[PDB]
Amino acid sequence: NRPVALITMATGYVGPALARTMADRGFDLVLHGTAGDGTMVGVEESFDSQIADLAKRGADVLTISDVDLTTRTGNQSMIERVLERFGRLDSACLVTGLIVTGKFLDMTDDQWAKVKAGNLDMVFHGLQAVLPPMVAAGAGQCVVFTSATGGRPDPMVSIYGGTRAGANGIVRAVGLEHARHGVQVNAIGTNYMDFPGFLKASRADGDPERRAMIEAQVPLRRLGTMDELSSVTAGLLDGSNRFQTGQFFDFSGGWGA
Amino acid sequence: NRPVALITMATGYVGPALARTMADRGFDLVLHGTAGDGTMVGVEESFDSQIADLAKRGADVLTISDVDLTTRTGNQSMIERVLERFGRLDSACLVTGLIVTGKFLDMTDDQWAKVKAGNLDMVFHGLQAVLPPMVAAGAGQCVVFTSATGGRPDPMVSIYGGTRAGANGIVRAVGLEHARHGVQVNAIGTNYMDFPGFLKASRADGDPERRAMIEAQVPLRRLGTMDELSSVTAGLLDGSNRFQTGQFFDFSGGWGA
Amino acid sequence: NRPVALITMATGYVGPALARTMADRGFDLVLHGTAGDGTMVGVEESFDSQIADLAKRGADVLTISDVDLTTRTGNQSMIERVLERFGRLDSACLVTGLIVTGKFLDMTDDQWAKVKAGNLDMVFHGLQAVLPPMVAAGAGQCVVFTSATGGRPDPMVSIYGGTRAGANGIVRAVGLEHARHGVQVNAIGTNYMDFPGFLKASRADGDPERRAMIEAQVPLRRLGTMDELSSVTAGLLDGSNRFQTGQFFDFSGGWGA
Amino acid sequence: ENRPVALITMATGYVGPALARTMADRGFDLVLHGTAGDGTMVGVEESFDSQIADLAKRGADVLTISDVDLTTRTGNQSMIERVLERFGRLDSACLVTGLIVTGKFLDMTDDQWAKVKAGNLDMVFHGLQAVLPPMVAAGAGQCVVFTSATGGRPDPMVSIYGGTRAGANGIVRAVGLEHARHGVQVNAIGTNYMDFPGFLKASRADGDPERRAMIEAQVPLRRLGTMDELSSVTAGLLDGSNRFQTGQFFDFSGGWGA
């Protein structure tokens, strides 16, 4: 019997690559994201284009694209649909967050209201939904993607970086509370990754002059690739490492060290 | 003229002792308080008994008891009133939070909203109100009280400790973002303190067998007094130390070491 | 043109397991350790027996067991022999440390001198030996095994825990000082692992119920295996992840969260 | 009548002078250890001849100790033996430790490595071993070990120095927790960008405003810390007013180590 791996926001960021890598390791996948083709605001790899590659790797694919992951209902709905299809949930990769930057005294009630939703509510409702089935099974592995800024909340990223630290804080407590059930909850915070999502936050967009200045701010003088991030993320979701929980791993080329 | 120091939730916890020593250090006082049934500090010393003593120490007191610090309007209104009374704001001690404990999967949507309001809203709107008058003056010292759990979000205090950890991160960024203006924003996190609030929550206010057990959980084998906590807090708000900002300080007899 | 992977104290702990998986990933190997067989003073797997298996996995092997890794000579010499055999060093796993425990005030000038040599001198000399060949090549992946006590130096393990924390600090700085040359240097710190060393130093066999008392102390209620550890270790040395450096990874089932 | 005793090492510079004045104001008798001599000497920012005079006007007696090697058991053990014979008690101790060593990690020699270990680690291990017995017997005591803000963020060009300082904090943490049940506190203060010679020389900005202008700009609060500020914070951990912190590390670098 093939285990199941849930990957939220799987139309972009690490989802696609992680989906291919998790399939190779013998997992069935339940991708969540934005339904659509390459010409979409939040889609860089479509479901159908993915389902054909994951099927050649021997994986069945449930897809979910009609849930507000910032609410209890949307998260519980996703999990209820995952369990009726496959009847199990062994791994969950909850990608969370809304990026908002600027001066702390220019932040508005709306910005403050919506950064808590992306960075904290997605984590709280996401974990309340994925854990119950893992607790009953006696084994599970979760990876909550927060942000490297949570490890070092810096100026001009105050509310965004602070709430991410709160997310990592929740992850630690939750990772240790359910460790005695064989369920692992860990956090992975990235920064300076090579994907269009981060290219929108920083006005580099492949610009050689602006790209070089961004690559200069990281100790390893390069941006991270989704092939690298998927490898380490799968290491915490493929049952090959069951001795880490409640921890936060900075993945930013030495930036968050 | 005398420097002005604001103290929130000043009827309990560190408020009383802090105002006593700050007056001894030459500060005028703005004491904020609340008797709302849903508040964590409580009423340990009434403003009626405090203004009497603090006036014997040479301080003029402004009292505020009709503002909700979980909202922008309440905080902004509170700062309108201090600047009309004294025309300046130098030090600010923002006590925040709303205690909620339990197993992560037993948390309700309102317990999750009550902790976001106490632990994060009071800080976002509190800091957005005290900083402008300090930045204009080019000087200022702020201390926001979070909790020792922010440095170690443990099981059974997942969303409390977690949101405290998010507030400590906000403090880090804000304390650095406004360091250029000579503004200090630090955060103190306490635990195992000797005051009616904690004594009653742990059911050790009239129990010797309980206190002995409770105190054995602190490396220093005792509960911290408010004179100790005010002495440490006053050193970050009396002008004697202008070289620490954006930092978190554990105050728990080593529990958070 | 297979890349080379150096592993030290490869007769026990992670050495044996790591070698196999590194061989599985296409690495020629250089193994340091002691001579003997059958846990004969730290020999969990004799070199004679390892090369046999590592050869079936298509990996050449060089053995070194006559150097003192607490000195500049032994380390600089060990690398002289690695490069004359293969002419390259792409990965290095430096295992370091001599265990000492007891009351801090009962420690002697001898115990203090010993733990410094195992926990600090080995790291300092080791890194000065493996880095040069990687800096020249422009690529390299190093891992220094310290101890989970380095993330939380506790009583009864003061000098041992502190010196480990010193090792981590070095690894942090060194990992950042050479990230611009494309060289990674990270640290792993374990505790409660299922291997003769910890088992003997914790009364594993003899009071076998004591093992249950020890497992109760780990959040995940188990001892880690060298397969899990080698999988994580290999992931920082197999070239799949080149976006982390100067970081410390606790590996103690959450005990260091 | 009966005054508490406070031991301060390396008292001729850094924080010792400003710390000795505020401790005496708080009613403490003092034990000053330093590399004694006149102001014209290296590391001597304020001679004991002048310090002792100032502290007596503040109502504090003073004992001087200037012939011990604080990197060895014999030195610290002797220092404390002479402290007890004079005052019969030891209540507070501020152990200043370390020896600055910077540069690229590869360029580090066995002698540099051996020396940063003796300054950042040997002084801590032996110092705490000598200070704690009388404090434990007295059921109460407070120690502050001065490491370095680098211990909180070991950066490039300061590897072995910051690394060993990190270990120093780790020892302070373990030792601070192990003896908390005896009423004894041990904490660590790590500073940087302080306005005093030792740092001004290391940073290569002693007589240069242009370079110091750059140095201060590296600090969030855009200035260098003063010994009055540091002595104030330090005295709070040694004057009996705060007995609820131990095994902790306090960064004091204007936000640089936040």
mmCIF file of C-alpha atoms in Angstrom, chain D residues 19-206:
data_model
loop_
_atom_site.group_PDB
_atom_site.id
_atom_site.type_symbol
_atom_site.label_atom_id
_atom_site.label_comp_id
_atom_site.label_asym_id
_atom_site.label_seq_id
_atom_site.Cartn_x
_atom_site.Cartn_y
_atom_site.Cartn_z
ATOM 1 C CA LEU D 19 31.668 48.987 38.015
ATOM 2 C CA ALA D 20 33.716 49.411 41.191
ATOM 3 C CA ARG D 21 32.333 52.921 41.717
ATOM 4 C CA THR D 22 28.672 51.913 41.437
ATOM 5 C CA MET D 23 29.126 48.775 43.550
ATOM 6 C CA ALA D 24 30.736 50.865 46.297
ATOM 7 C CA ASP D 25 27.823 53.313 46.072
ATOM 8 C CA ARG D 26 25.586 50.281 46.661
ATOM 9 C CA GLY D 27 27.441 49.466 49.891
ATOM 10 C CA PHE D 28 29.921 46.838 48.665
ATOM 11 C CA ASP D 29 33.471 46.208 49.756
ATOM 12 C CA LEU D 30 35.663 45.500 46.755
ATOM 13 C CA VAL D 31 38.437 43.171 45.634
ATOM 14 C CA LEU D 32 40.219 44.546 42.561
ATOM 15 C CA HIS D 33 42.400 42.298 40.396
ATOM 16 C CA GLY D 34 44.352 43.840 37.529
ATOM 17 C CA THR D 35 47.732 44.122 35.845
ATOM 18 C CA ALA D 36 48.702 46.753 38.397
ATOM 19 C CA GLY D 37 50.832 49.776 37.548
ATOM 20 C CA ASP D 38 50.596 53.422 36.554
ATOM 21 C CA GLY D 39 48.345 54.781 33.817
ATOM 22 C CA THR D 40 51.295 54.827 31.410
ATOM 23 C CA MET D 41 51.115 51.011 31.258
ATOM 24 C CA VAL D 42 49.279 48.979 28.630
ATOM 25 C CA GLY D 43 45.771 47.962 29.655
ATOM 26 C CA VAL D 44 45.889 50.320 32.657
ATOM 27 C CA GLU D 45 43.143 52.882 32.053
ATOM 28 C CA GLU D 46 42.776 53.830 35.742
ATOM 29 C CA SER D 47 45.490 52.946 38.242
ATOM 30 C CA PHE D 48 44.570 51.355 41.554
ATOM 31 C CA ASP D 49 46.266 54.261 43.350
ATOM 32 C CA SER D 50 43.541 56.546 41.989
ATOM 33 C CA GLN D 51 40.693 54.020 42.115
ATOM 34 C CA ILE D 52 41.264 53.074 45.760
ATOM 35 C CA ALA D 53 41.127 56.757 46.707
ATOM 36 C CA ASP D 54 37.847 57.352 44.867
ATOM 37 C CA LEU D 55 36.209 54.217 46.280
ATOM 38 C CA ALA D 56 37.141 55.112 49.866
ATOM 39 C CA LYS D 57 35.217 58.386 49.578
ATOM 40 C CA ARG D 58 32.237 56.209 48.603
ATOM 41 C CA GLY D 59 32.578 54.225 51.833
ATOM 42 C CA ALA D 60 34.145 51.033 50.452
ATOM 43 C CA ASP D 61 37.352 49.322 51.484
ATOM 44 C CA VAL D 62 39.491 47.775 48.751
ATOM 45 C CA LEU D 63 41.880 44.842 48.411
ATOM 46 C CA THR D 64 44.334 44.754 45.503
ATOM 47 C CA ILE D 65 45.597 41.612 43.743
ATOM 48 C CA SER D 66 48.084 42.036 40.893
ATOM 49 C CA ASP D 67 50.332 38.959 40.851
ATOM 50 C CA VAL D 68 48.221 35.999 39.702
ATOM 51 C CA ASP D 69 47.732 34.115 36.431
ATOM 52 C CA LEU D 70 43.951 33.906 36.000
ATOM 53 C CA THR D 71 44.374 31.254 33.262
ATOM 54 C CA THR D 72 45.429 28.605 35.805
ATOM 55 C CA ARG D 73 43.923 26.903 38.836
ATOM 56 C CA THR D 74 46.676 28.221 41.113
ATOM 57 C CA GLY D 75 46.013 31.877 40.296
ATOM 58 C CA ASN D 76 42.247 31.943 40.777
ATOM 59 C CA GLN D 77 42.440 29.582 43.761
ATOM 60 C CA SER D 78 45.017 31.880 45.366
ATOM 61 C CA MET D 79 43.041 35.027 44.526
ATOM 62 C CA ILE D 80 39.968 33.725 46.348
ATOM 63 C CA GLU D 81 42.029 32.469 49.296
ATOM 64 C CA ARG D 82 43.324 36.023 49.724
ATOM 65 C CA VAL D 83 39.796 37.402 49.302
ATOM 66 C CA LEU D 84 38.455 35.319 52.193
ATOM 67 C CA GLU D 85 41.368 36.032 54.542
ATOM 68 C CA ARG D 86 40.697 39.774 54.199
ATOM 69 C CA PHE D 87 36.878 39.828 54.204
ATOM 70 C CA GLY D 88 35.897 36.303 55.262
ATOM 71 C CA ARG D 89 33.205 36.239 52.577
ATOM 72 C CA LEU D 90 32.530 36.552 48.858
ATOM 73 C CA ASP D 91 29.096 37.660 47.649
ATOM 74 C CA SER D 92 29.601 38.957 44.096
ATOM 75 C CA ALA D 93 32.246 38.313 41.447
ATOM 76 C CA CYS D 94 32.658 39.887 38.005
ATOM 77 C CA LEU D 95 35.103 37.730 36.033
ATOM 78 C CA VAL D 96 36.384 39.597 32.980
ATOM 79 C CA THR D 97 38.015 37.112 30.612
ATOM 80 C CA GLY D 98 39.397 36.753 27.118
ATOM 81 C CA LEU D 99 42.105 37.660 24.623
ATOM 82 C CA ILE D 100 41.168 39.192 21.280
ATOM 83 C CA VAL D 101 42.364 37.294 18.209
ATOM 84 C CA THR D 102 41.040 38.128 14.734
ATOM 85 C CA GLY D 103 41.899 37.157 11.174
ATOM 86 C CA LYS D 104 41.115 34.528 8.586
ATOM 87 C CA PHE D 105 40.492 31.073 10.024
ATOM 88 C CA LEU D 106 43.135 29.413 7.832
ATOM 89 C CA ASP D 107 45.825 31.876 8.939
ATOM 90 C CA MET D 108 45.250 30.863 12.573
ATOM 91 C CA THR D 109 48.312 29.273 14.179
ATOM 92 C CA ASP D 110 48.578 26.683 16.934
ATOM 93 C CA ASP D 111 49.819 29.480 19.210
ATOM 94 C CA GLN D 112 46.911 31.817 18.434
ATOM 95 C CA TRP D 113 44.505 28.906 18.926
ATOM 96 C CA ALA D 114 46.157 27.975 22.220
ATOM 97 C CA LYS D 115 45.998 31.587 23.410
ATOM 98 C CA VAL D 116 42.358 32.306 22.563
ATOM 99 C CA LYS D 117 41.535 29.093 24.438
ATOM 100 C CA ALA D 118 43.489 30.257 27.488
ATOM 101 C CA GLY D 119 41.794 33.661 27.469
ATOM 102 C CA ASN D 120 38.226 32.737 26.566
ATOM 103 C CA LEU D 121 37.978 29.310 28.253
ATOM 104 C CA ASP D 122 40.724 28.658 30.816
ATOM 105 C CA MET D 123 39.886 31.881 32.672
ATOM 106 C CA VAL D 124 36.213 30.876 32.830
ATOM 107 C CA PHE D 125 36.704 27.276 33.963
ATOM 108 C CA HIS D 126 39.244 28.144 36.658
ATOM 109 C CA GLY D 127 37.554 31.379 37.713
ATOM 110 C CA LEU D 128 34.159 29.802 38.318
ATOM 111 C CA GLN D 129 35.792 26.840 40.069
ATOM 112 C CA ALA D 130 37.446 29.205 42.557
ATOM 113 C CA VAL D 131 34.511 31.583 43.082
ATOM 114 C CA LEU D 132 31.661 29.129 43.656
ATOM 115 C CA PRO D 133 32.735 27.211 46.806
ATOM 116 C CA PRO D 134 32.383 30.183 49.188
ATOM 117 C CA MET D 135 29.150 31.308 47.517
ATOM 118 C CA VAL D 136 27.661 27.807 47.765
ATOM 119 C CA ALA D 137 28.679 27.503 51.419
ATOM 120 C CA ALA D 138 27.107 30.916 52.071
ATOM 121 C CA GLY D 139 23.903 29.756 50.361
ATOM 122 C CA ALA D 140 23.927 32.823 48.098
ATOM 123 C CA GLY D 141 26.084 34.485 45.480
ATOM 124 C CA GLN D 142 26.069 36.269 42.145
ATOM 125 C CA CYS D 143 28.586 35.971 39.311
ATOM 126 C CA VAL D 144 28.847 37.778 35.977
ATOM 127 C CA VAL D 145 31.237 36.311 33.407
ATOM 128 C CA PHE D 146 32.197 38.763 30.661
ATOM 129 C CA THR D 147 32.508 36.909 27.354
ATOM 130 C CA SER D 148 31.753 38.755 24.107
ATOM 131 C CA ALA D 149 28.829 39.646 21.869
ATOM 132 C CA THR D 150 30.681 37.598 19.240
ATOM 133 C CA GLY D 151 29.749 34.504 21.236
ATOM 134 C CA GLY D 152 26.159 35.172 20.194
ATOM 135 C CA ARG D 153 27.000 35.455 16.476
ATOM 136 C CA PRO D 154 30.407 33.968 15.609
ATOM 137 C CA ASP D 155 31.103 35.667 12.278
ATOM 138 C CA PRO D 156 33.849 35.436 9.649
ATOM 139 C CA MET D 157 37.279 36.850 10.534
ATOM 140 C CA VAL D 158 36.499 36.164 14.222
ATOM 141 C CA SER D 159 35.980 32.392 14.097
ATOM 142 C CA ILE D 160 38.128 30.931 16.876
ATOM 143 C CA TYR D 161 37.573 34.020 19.037
ATOM 144 C CA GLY D 162 33.785 34.062 18.706
ATOM 145 C CA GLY D 163 33.570 30.275 18.716
ATOM 146 C CA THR D 164 35.372 29.841 22.028
ATOM 147 C CA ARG D 165 33.296 32.711 23.440
ATOM 148 C CA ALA D 166 30.220 30.711 22.445
ATOM 149 C CA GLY D 167 31.598 27.805 24.456
ATOM 150 C CA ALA D 168 32.158 30.200 27.351
ATOM 151 C CA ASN D 169 28.461 31.106 27.277
ATOM 152 C CA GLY D 170 27.665 27.393 27.187
ATOM 153 C CA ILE D 171 29.714 26.741 30.312
ATOM 154 C CA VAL D 172 28.050 29.713 32.002
ATOM 155 C CA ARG D 173 24.646 28.269 31.084
ATOM 156 C CA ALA D 174 25.392 24.789 32.428
ATOM 157 C CA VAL D 175 27.188 26.080 35.521
ATOM 158 C CA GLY D 176 24.521 28.731 36.086
ATOM 159 C CA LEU D 177 21.781 26.096 36.114
ATOM 160 C CA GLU D 178 23.741 23.511 38.108
ATOM 161 C CA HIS D 179 24.251 25.818 41.108
ATOM 162 C CA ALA D 180 20.911 27.649 40.983
ATOM 163 C CA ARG D 181 19.631 25.279 43.682
ATOM 164 C CA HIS D 182 22.279 26.723 46.033
ATOM 165 C CA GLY D 183 21.037 30.296 45.604
ATOM 166 C CA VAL D 184 24.001 31.122 43.347
ATOM 167 C CA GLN D 185 23.597 32.925 40.023
ATOM 168 C CA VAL D 186 26.052 32.863 37.122
ATOM 169 C CA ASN D 187 25.330 34.879 33.974
ATOM 170 C CA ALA D 188 27.222 36.055 30.904
ATOM 171 C CA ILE D 189 27.450 39.526 29.371
ATOM 172 C CA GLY D 190 28.775 39.797 25.826
ATOM 173 C CA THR D 191 29.614 43.297 24.631
ATOM 174 C CA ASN D 192 30.820 44.925 21.427
ATOM 175 C CA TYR D 193 31.279 48.430 20.049
ATOM 176 C CA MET D 194 32.087 49.681 23.548
ATOM 177 C CA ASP D 195 33.798 53.066 23.913
ATOM 178 C CA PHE D 196 37.084 52.041 25.524
ATOM 179 C CA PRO D 197 40.712 51.583 24.396
ATOM 180 C CA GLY D 198 40.792 47.791 24.051
ATOM 181 C CA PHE D 199 38.085 47.878 21.388
ATOM 182 C CA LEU D 200 39.294 51.125 19.814
ATOM 183 C CA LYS D 201 42.675 49.501 19.147
ATOM 184 C CA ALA D 202 41.271 46.212 17.831
ATOM 185 C CA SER D 203 38.855 48.004 15.487
ATOM 186 C CA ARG D 204 41.651 50.276 14.182
ATOM 187 C CA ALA D 205 39.777 53.475 15.059
ATOM 188 C CA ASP D 206 41.518 54.741 18.205
#
